[PDB]
């Protein structure tokens with residue numbers, strides 16, 4: 141159940157550069173998901189020690205959570221919006237491939253993913 145080090149959230153040697161899409165991902169997508177009543181399991185990395193999940197990080201090879209994504213967006217870690225979208229997708233995929241369907245945590249992920257996909261439908265165009 142040992143936990144990996146937390147993912148990196150800052151890149152000390154990349155330029156500070158926004159795009160309209162990255163602004164949208166932070167100020168619309170992340171903001172909306174973060175305040176949802178079902179966000180709390182996803183606001184920090186899975187703690188396999190405290191949740192007693194010895195197999196979690198043997199099955200989940202790319203851990204991801206919204207706290208990491210939030211910090212990455214705030215620190216301008218991503219070079220483009222697609223890297224951020226992939227992190228969201230990884231977070232949901234991890235939940236769905238580890239947990240049993242109908243588990244409460246899967247229902248929570250499904251509700252958050254619906255909101256995520258609706259907001260991504262309105263992602264502004266590259267510019």
Ligand SMILES: CCOc1cc(N2CCC(O)CC2)ccc1Nc1ncc2c(n1)N(C)c1ccccc1C(=O)N2C
Nearest residue numbers: 180181182184185186187191193196234235238239245
């Ligand atoms: C920072 C606080 O974190 C928690 C507190 C409590 N508590 C608070 C108080 C109550 O009275 C007692 C339970 C329960 C869970 C979490 N966290 C948490 N993080 C990640 C996961 C998750 N739960 N669930 C539920 C999972 C369960 C099994 C296998 C995988 C997962 C999973 O995929 N995710 C995303």
